[PDB]
Structures are given as structure tokens and as C-alpha cells.
């Protein structure tokens, strides 16, 4: 265990590289990536048709990927959506350089 | 398990190292490795 | 007194009778945190709040 690897893992989780890692892990279990893309698209279409009002700020495709990751034993936030606890107040948005 | 280099690193050496990292760890780890290398390079420059 | 040929007034982009299409600013040649990659310049706010490179542009609309 390296002692000074807290901020790196924190930034990896916050930025969204978890999505890339999960995509690579889910493509390492598929022969043809095009059929995987079509399957994910169909599942996201079913999710959208089931609950329209649920989405709009939460992505159905990210929700499908998070469900597939959670069903594989790896804990992932629902649709990879996280909120900033250190937000100053309403109407204040962070500036990502 | 990575080698330790005590020689000058150049563009061809960097391309070789990136190809070997893509072969060993895959593109997923290589992306983060390349980002960290870019950050360190800019800092030292 | 002014002879036949001397300069009475100075037009735009001209000061003292010589062509002046720019400004003289302090410059350093070094890499800074990637902001200079390829060709790119990192400039200070002094050029902004002192109107060093301010310009006026006039566009016409007619019907």
C-alpha cells in the first residue's frame, strides 16, 4: 500500500475514469463490440421506455452500465452520478480548468 | 513489475515504452499512465 | 509653422508619423505548465485591465 495515493484515487473516482475501466472490463467479456453496443442501446431504450420522468439528469446508459457492474460484484454508484458535498450554495457551480 | 531506466529517454524510447505498456497493462491503464507522465513532464519542463 | 509636406495629424495605427501596428510588451521564452504547447501564449491580466490591446470595430447594417 503506497502511502501518498489518496488524492490520485480520489481524482480517478471523481473525474469519471471508473466509466472507462468498467467499459474495458465489460468489453473484455465480449467477442464482438458492435453487438455489445447494440445490446446496451436496446437495454437503455427499454429503461427509458419504462420510466421517462426518471431520466433527464441521470443517464440511462450509465444506469445500465452501473447495474451490470453491480451485478458482477463491483460496487458502482447508480449511473455513475455523484454530487459535490463541498458546494457553496444554490446557483454556485464549480469551474473545471 | 516495471524496469528501472538509468539512461536518457527519447521519443523512440517513449514510443517503445508506451507500446509495451499497451501490450502488458492494456489501453485502460496506459491512459492514466500517459496522463501522469504528461503532468510530470510539463512540471519538470 | 508647417511646410508643404509635413504631418499635421496622426491617423489610426500611426504615432509620430511612423506605422504602428502593435505594442511593445515584456516577453520570456520558456515553457509554462503546458499553456505554451504547440503555439500558444500565456499572457497576463495587465494587458487586459490597462487596455494595451483594446480595439474598436464598427459593423454596418442596412435595409
Curated annotation (Swiss-Prot), chain B:
Organism annotation: Nicotiana tabacum
Quaternary structure annotation from Swiss-Prot or TrEMBL: In plastids the minimal PEP RNA polymerase catalytic core is composed of four subunits: alpha, beta, beta', and beta''. When a (nuclear-encoded) sigma factor is associated with the core the holoenzyme is formed, which can initiate transcription.
Record-stated family: Belongs to the RNA polymerase beta' chain family. RpoC2 subfamily.
Span within the parent record: 10 to 54 of 1392
Function summary: DNA-dependent RNA polymerase catalyzes the transcription of DNA into RNA using the four ribonucleoside triphosphates as substrates.
Compartmental location: Plastid, Chloroplast
Name used for this protein in its record: DNA-directed RNA polymerase subunit beta''
Gene designation: rpoC2
Curated annotation (Swiss-Prot), chain C:
Subcellular location: Plastid, Chloroplast
Subunit relationships: In plastids the minimal PEP RNA polymerase catalytic core is composed of four subunits: alpha, beta, beta', and beta''. When a (nuclear-encoded) sigma factor is associated with the core the holoenzyme is formed, which can initiate transcription.
Protein purpose: DNA-dependent RNA polymerase catalyzes the transcription of DNA into RNA using the four ribonucleoside triphosphates as substrates.
Family that this chain belongs to: Belongs to the RNA polymerase beta chain family.
Protein name as catalogued: DNA-directed RNA polymerase subunit beta
Gene source species: Nicotiana tabacum (Common tobacco)
Amino acid at each position: 500500500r503506497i502511502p501518498f495515493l489518496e488524492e490520485q484515487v480520489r481524482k480517478i473516482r471523481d473525474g469519471g475514469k471508473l466509466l472507462t475501466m468498467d467499459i474495458h472490463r465489460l468489453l473484455l467479456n465480449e467477442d464482438n463490440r458492435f453487438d455489445f453496443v447494440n445490446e446496451i442501446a436496446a437495454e437503455a431504450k427499454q429503461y427509458v421506455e419504462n420510466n421517462r420522468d426518471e431520466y433527464g439528469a441521470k443517464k440511462a446508459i450509465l444506469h445500465v452500465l452501473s447495474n451490470r457492474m453491480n451485478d458482477a460484484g463491483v460496487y458502482r454508484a447508480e449511473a455513475y452520478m455523484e454530487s459535490d458535498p463541498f458546494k457553496p450554495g444554490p446557483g454556485y457551480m464549480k469551474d473545471e480548468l | 513489475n516495471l524496469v528501472f531506466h538509468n539512461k536518457a529517454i527519447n521519443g523512440t524510447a517513449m514510443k517503445r515504452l508506451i507500446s509495451r505498456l499497451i501490450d502488458h497493462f492494456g489501453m485502460a491503464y496506459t491512459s492514466h499512465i500517459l496522463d501522469q507522465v504528461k503532468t510530470l513532464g510539463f512540471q519538470q519542463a | 509653422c508647417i511646410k508643404k509636406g509635413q504631418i499635421l495629424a496622426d491617423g489610426a495605427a500611426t504615432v509620430g508619423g511612423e506605422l504602428a501596428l502593435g505594442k511593445n510588451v515584456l516577453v520570456a521564452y520558456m515553457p509554462w505548465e503546458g499553456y505554451n504547447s504547440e503555439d500558444a501564449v500565456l499572457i497576463s491580466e495587465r494587458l487586459v485591465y490597462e487596455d494595451i490591446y483594446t480595439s474598436f470595430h464598427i459593423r454596418k447594417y442596412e435595409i
